[PDB]
């Protein structure tokens, strides 16, 4: 066991679970929505080409990010 091999397993699980959470948050494959689900605005072309399947424009997205930063 050596006490660093188990530490290795712990670190491996920690990094992998973090990596895959931050990957699942991407949702690359998606739907062409074409209009914001918050303000109905035109989600500009470049943002839909970068993130296929967005649901918020950058303004509503950053807004939501602030709140989910604090919590709730």
């Amino acid at each position: 066991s050596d006490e660093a091999d188990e530490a290795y397993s712990v670190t491996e699980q920690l990094t992998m679970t973090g990596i895959n959470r931050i990957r699942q948050k991407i949702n690359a494959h998606g739907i062409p929505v074409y209009l914001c689900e918050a303000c109905g605005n035109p989600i500009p072309e470049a943002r839909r080409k970068i993130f296929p399947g967005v649901t918020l424009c950058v303004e509503c997205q950053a807004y939501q990010e602030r709140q989910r930063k604090h919590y709730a």
Binding site: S1, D2, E3, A4, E6, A7, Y8, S9, V10, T11, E12, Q13, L14, T15, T17, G18, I19, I22, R23, K25, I26, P44, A46, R47, I50, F51, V58, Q61, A62, E65
Partner: protein, 1164 residues
Amino acid sequence: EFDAIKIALASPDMIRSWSFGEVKKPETINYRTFKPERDGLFCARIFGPVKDYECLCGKYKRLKHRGVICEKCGVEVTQTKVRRERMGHIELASPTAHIWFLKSLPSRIGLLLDMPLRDIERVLYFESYVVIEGGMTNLERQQILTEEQYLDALEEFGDEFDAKMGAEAIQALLKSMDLEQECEQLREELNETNSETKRKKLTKRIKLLEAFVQSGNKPEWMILTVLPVLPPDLRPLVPLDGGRFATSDLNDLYRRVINRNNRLKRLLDLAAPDIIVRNEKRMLQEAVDALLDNGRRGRAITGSNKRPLKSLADMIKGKQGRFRQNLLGKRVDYSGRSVITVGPYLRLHQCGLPKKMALELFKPFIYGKLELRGLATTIKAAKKMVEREEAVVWDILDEVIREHPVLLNRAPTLHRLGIQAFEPVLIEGKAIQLHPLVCAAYNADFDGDQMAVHVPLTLEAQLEARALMMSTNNILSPANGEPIIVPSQDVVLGLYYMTRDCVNAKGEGMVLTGPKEAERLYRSGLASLHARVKVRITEYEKDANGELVAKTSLKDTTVGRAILWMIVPKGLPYSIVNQALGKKAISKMLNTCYRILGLKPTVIFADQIMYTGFAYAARSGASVGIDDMVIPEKKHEIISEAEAEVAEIQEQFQSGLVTAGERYNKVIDIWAAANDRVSKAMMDNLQTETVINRDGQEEKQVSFNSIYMMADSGARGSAAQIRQLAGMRGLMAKPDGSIIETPITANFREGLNVLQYFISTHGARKGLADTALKTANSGYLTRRLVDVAQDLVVTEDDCGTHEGIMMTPVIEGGDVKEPLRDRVLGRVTAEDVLKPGTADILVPRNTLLHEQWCDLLEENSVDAVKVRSVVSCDTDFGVCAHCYGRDLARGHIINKGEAIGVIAAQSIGEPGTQLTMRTFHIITGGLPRVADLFEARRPKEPAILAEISGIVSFGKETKGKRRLVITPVDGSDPYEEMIPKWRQLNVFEGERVERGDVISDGPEAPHDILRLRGVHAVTRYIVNEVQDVYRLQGVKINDKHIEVIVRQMLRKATIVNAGSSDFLEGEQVEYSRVKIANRELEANGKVGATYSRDLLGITKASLATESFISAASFQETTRVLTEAAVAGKRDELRGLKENVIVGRLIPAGTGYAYHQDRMRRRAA
């Protein structure tokens, strides 16, 4: 000798019955002579002599004067171990309420008087008088009076008025009490008090009143009048070095009681006023309290220190108490530890014992031998011989040790394989030599671990080590029958290197005559160990009624394949060694050898495998270099592309095209993906190499690279650590779980610079800090489980029940993740398995489904077998061998006796140690989820079920919750539910739903599943969930063990219809009892009582034990003992933990026959 322990309240007279004398003075010893005092806590008259057969002063100094009482000091001349046995008593000048029966939560004095606790405490600490039988004068019995009020009420009442305050008041309240009379009045009120709180507490009180009647206790014995004194040698005042003494805290508390009691006698004799004598009585009360249980009053009195003193309740409870680590965990003689080394030449049944440890442990045996053979005249001469360590003590050592196992044990005994009997092989040096194939069971590496050896002393313990715990008997994991003798790292790399061909070695395509010739060719160096040759192989196949027909043929194998075939026993096919033979190939090789041939050929095979693996691994010459980390050339190309992608995403983010966290996610993903490309590129560079060849053209074969050979043979390592060695390191976490988005684009064949080596430290220190603390509480799940499943034992051969769970495959959405043959192997069928033709009884019944029957079952494609479960066993106070299954630690069926509950606890706890220590959510995982599972906690969001069957219907709208009623097709609908509209429904009001069906969605509380559907439903739920975790991490543990833990879980019953029986309605009873009760009452001309099955979390079920010696171990000793005293309980031992404590054989193992014969006597 006793067969049972009884307990009760101690009468004052009985406390004087124990006593040998009344301690009066507070003094301890003389301060000059150090002699015991005439009435101190350390007396000689009271507690006996100080030296053996020698009075205090010294007039009588002969053992011939035995038993006579000296005249000048009255100290009877006996042995001074008598002073460790004799109690004294203290005649309290005032009654003092025993703190356990007062400050315990229910407060037996309070709930027995039917009086509030604060009110008794007011009468007790001298606040308010209490009416104690105040005649007819309009006074209220137990009605408190205050001081002024008592005066003025006494005004106009020169008549008695009978009011008292203090502990004497409570004593006169209890003594006057009529218990059967109050039982009668409470029955008469329970007649006509048909309202919940009233008749509820009516019954809850009449229970304790009837119990106090039965137990023989008198109610007023809870008011101490005499106080017993622990004997001196249980609370010594021994001298330390240089005139120094060390005492117990108990002596301090005892002196405090004696002083205040003597001062109270003084105050009463001096006719002091009311304030002083009241305050002295309060002081004596607090002193006696602190003596019994220091800390329940507040505050814990401190000694000559800041810390509280330790008291009697402290002397029993707490891990420093008697139960915890003096009643189970004891220091043991004939034992010793050292530092283990390899000793790779031993067999599976022996251990290298150093000559010096062996000469110390086996000392009495050697003395007996030297005086038996005449080599030593007397035991003193033998002592001097073996002290000089002469030349014949060594021959005597060889003879004594010859067939005499030693138990080897390593500190975290997670399972029973952390103890094995080995035969000692005497060695030089001071390190214990431990077999290599045993480290997996012991969890022992040879980097400084130590092992403790114990010596079995009796013939019966020698035969228990040899027959039971010998290392060649335990080779299968008791959690799952796979062999625990899997060869680990030099062995598998040896067998992989030898059993692994290459395209053009020396001597290609020779046709050898057989394995002997291949070995003779290799060892003379004419052929290479992996040179594909046609070899003539004779394999023996028991394809018969065990007949072993021989068959010879011409296989195509490497030279090492055939060299290794020489070691494989007969019954094994030849395809077992004809592939590369990594790690799983070797484990499966041992496994098929065990399923064909049994235990003796498998032990021989395991040893031969270790020997040949080590030999051909040394000949392998398999070193590790720096040129063995082949960094791929396309690594910097891939990193340039990923760096360009992150630069592009940062440019877009700067232009407001993305947010901040969005771009963080994007860049973390870019780096993880480029890391995957680099790891893939490096492993495709490393996992193959070019080579020439018969005809001369280049040809690709699997690489003989050493780092890869070690990762790919399964010997050690894996492609992830390989990626960190030559590929890039990747992104690193923080302790919070966030991911630092500056990756480690370096490897370890290159270096990390100061910043990347700092960044890696975050996750490294987090992982090590967790692994250091998981090591602390390594065995808490095992202990929690052995608390509840301890007394469960296999006590019967067949219960006959036809109940059984339907074992089927688990199809996790797509394919099966665990087939039926694996879940069903080893279980006893409950009914006849019909062929798919639906008329052919495939496996009849009670047929131990071994591998033959299991293959027959998978062959016909019968995929739902009804097997008998430990949870559906009709046995009482045990389980039968048929409802249990096979052993899984031994291939055979379970024996009558085997203590399967402790096996189940350890088989779930030890494998759990390989699980994550912290829960992670993906279906959560880790050990804490498993512990919460077994605790059967209620999920906050319960998917609500359908309590009754019938047509669905709704009701009132939004009284907090939308209301619903289910109304049967022909029955009544008295059940309606306040379904939260938050609980978004699943079925419309116009679809008649069967009982036990989902209404809302979410986690199903197991209590509701058990109450709606069969016990089989709750058991399948629990095993499927917990095995979901255990399969999440990849760990294999059988369902038998979860099933037995569950059967310990749902072992309480709640009675609905009390029938013609003698059970109260809203009562919970041990289900194993109510079963026999209704069975008996239905035997005669009555009908049984119907109950609702219950369910308790393991920490809740283990708190309900039939005994109290056991229950005072893992519980609060104080509450359990107070309850047992007021109940007059007796422990008829009948348990594992109780018989451990009390010091006799347990009824589990070999002790089963002893207890059976003893029950024969006790029933005769």
